[PDB]
Design a protein around this ligand. Structure first.
Ligand SMILES: [Cl-]
Ligand SMILES: [Cl-]
Ligand SMILES: [Cl-]
Ligand SMILES: [Cl-]
Ligand SMILES: [Cl-]
Ligand SMILES: [Cl-]
Lengths: 250, 249, 250, 249
């Protein structure tokens, strides 16, 4: 069994690849930084069980993994883009195009690249990592929320067509997952260190903590296990019960 | 009150422009065909209460209207694309981009063009006409259903930023609305006349009929009326109770 | 055209009945206090256009209105019950039974009483007033949130069966609607007067105000107009964009 | 870790008890039939890893288990009622009360019985097995679909209060799960053997099969495992992609 996780250094990347590798999958990894062979090799060294690739675009990635490692059983589309808050009238339209490009066109492209081999084999699992920002409670986050909702809906729609070919499709919509060193999207600092941030988490999440990479990994790996294919089409709101607002005052 | 309805000849376009007009709004209408004087004037003539414009692109359309008529109070982004079923791998990625450009970047670009002027007065209404396909029961409609959910989510997200500024934002997510002569998306032929289509409707919708332009224009006009701004952020599933599924055999 | 609004002195009651009366409906009104003819008559006097009834239970109410005023075209089930926040282990089970009785059994009972005449006539509209507390962001509100979600789901399910008989069914799920003198659920005081409450509203709602009775009335009346029957099965979240949480701090 | 599964012979009951056991949990099982020594011991004998109890009522069942086994870490409220289609006016209000009592007051009463002890240790998991009927595509299932949504909403509401206390709460909302010999709700006959039922499944579910007990027990066991507490509040639509609707004819 062979899996690909994109953007492996950020967001859901490491939790997914590490937990998948432990489950006995051969895991190919993608990252922008794997353009430079310095970076690739420093990552191959640190992580001898993972298999990082130079390939950058969806179709050359799928073919490169398919050449080397067999045939893709699992796609984890771990999509990232900078959120910077701003009012609608300030954004340029070309900004929304880039947002949709990173968060929405990308997973479609990866699914579209892998789908016909999975269908031929009548097996595969496809998992988009999106965000709980979809129809979420934020303001001035509009380009981001909407592109993520695009990607979740794409997952749910694909499930309906690929079910016939025995391929479950899932979206994982996180909030408050500790991203460690990565800025996408809850780096240990300021989130574990700054008392103002720590107070925000305890205020608005039900479990009053950040989620761990390992939780995000365990979920990815359960979905990819073949244990619960019948959940196909589910968007999983991995957000520790966010949002939680307080009772009326006084 | 001045309103712009885009793609007025299609989908929800005529219901909206007509029902808005009938309530007192001054309605500027956009359409691809209005690129032609002849097509424009035929419309103007058939519809003397409406004010067809020729402009095609968001910034230019917004400014044309703001000149002619002084300001834009109401945006109805009546967005349309060809609903073509292919398996996901039968598509090219550029087809998804085109669908996203028509259904998602378009209404963003209109919103972004009119926003700062609505924000200045602390008043306005923004309505996106999307589709019930968004998180719906269909297969091989993957590009369409997901682009439509992006638009709907974009409306809901904007309602949250623009509420500060007293600007309600909505989406209307239709299914089965009789669109008369327009192929978007339920032309009266074959949907009122061909027994299978008639049957499909009867099977799968709760009220067992097509929806009407009037029903849709009435909703647009209600949301625009200022009577219930507090509904801001709502996505309206205008789908006659679709989908309905038979009991166990 | 004849309409009934229950619990007319509270929650959505007056906005609905007053706005419906203006639309040309003959409006029968129900209230617990109409048990005492003092109260009935003081209300009939104040509101000569409305038609208050003594009848208390669903079936005697429907028959009493049907006898006097013709035939019920519109039911507005304006359901109320005390919310008092509490942890699960504190509630007695019998409390949850009373909650479900008031918020869930009641609308079913009213629908079940009116449905067979509407179906015979192939016309009628049925509107439950529920709450945005359903799957909402509160904690320790659990009995209330769940009974309201029961009533919204009941509306959506009824729409699917009664559509065949040309009867649209709707739920209106409010939050932050000014209830004036009524404690159900946002009385002018403390909500319009107490600076702490005023600050809470401006914080967590998008429009940064309470909604008016008149807005809640206008919606009821549009749905009941016969203008947009195709919306049948919709739950309307009349909550001015609540909830809105703030950006990450710092 | 000690777990209670209610109504173990039905619906999601056997998948849960078996898969939990197989993972190491000590599983106490409840069932209406265990009111009978004979029925109880036949079960015990067939299933030596499980620990059938005789108690019937929430407070008494919770306390029986807490004595026998010291504490309750995991509650799986596997609730069942007869799914009988009548038009809404064909019902009596008391039938709705009974459905609500079985599907909604029951899991509340179990939650409320076990809560204070989970809260004391700051640990536990609560899982309600509800149904995808909740906001679903059916007609004349009005009592059932609405009671199931109440239960699901109750789980989500509790996840928000009990998170402070480190207690994850979930609902699992199934459709089309092969229930073997149980009539709740997809017995292998006629659903694996009768051509129409086989066809109905193939038409309306995405994966075109029934779901399995194993698939459901695996989910219960995963949620109970403590591996992904951060999913708390989730309602799981375990429905093979149901509903799926045909394209236009
Ligand atoms: Cl960022
Ligand atoms: Cl996150
Ligand atoms: Cl439509
Ligand atoms: Cl109260
Ligand atoms: Cl309210
Ligand atoms: Cl099932």
């Amino acid at each position: 069994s062979t899996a690909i996780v994109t953007n492996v250094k950020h967001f859901g990347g490491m939790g997914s690849a590490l937990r998948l590798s432990e489950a006995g999958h051969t895991v190919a990894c993608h990252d922008e930084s794997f353009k430079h062979q310095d970076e690739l090799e420093a990552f191959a060294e640190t992580y001898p069980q993972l298999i990082p690739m130079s390939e950058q675009e969806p179709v050359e990635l799928i073919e490169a993994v398919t050449s080397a490692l067999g045939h893709v059983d699992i796609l984890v589309s771990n999509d990232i883009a900078p959120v910077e808050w701003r009012p609608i009238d300030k954004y340029a339209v070309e900004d929304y195009r880039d947002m949709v490009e990173a968060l929405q066109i990308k997973p479609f492209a990866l699914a579209n690249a892998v789908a016909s081999q999975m269908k031929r084999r009548k097996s595969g699992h496809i998992i988009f990592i999106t965000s709980a920002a979809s129809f979420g409670p934020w303001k001035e986050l509009s380009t981001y929320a909407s592109a993520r909702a695009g990607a979740s809906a794409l997952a749910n729609a694909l499930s309906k067509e690929l079910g016939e070919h025995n391929i479950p499709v899932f979206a994982i919509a996180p909030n408050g997952v500790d991203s460690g060193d990565s800025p996408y999207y809850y780096p240990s600092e300021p989130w574990k260190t700054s008392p103002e941030h720590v107070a925000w988490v305890r205020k608005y999440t039900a479990l009053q903590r950040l989620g761990t990479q390992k939780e995000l990994g365990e979920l990815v790996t359960f979905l990819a296990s073949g244990s619960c294919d019948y959940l196909t089409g589910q968007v999983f709101w991995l957000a520790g019960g966010f949002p939680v607002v307080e009772r009326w005052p006084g």
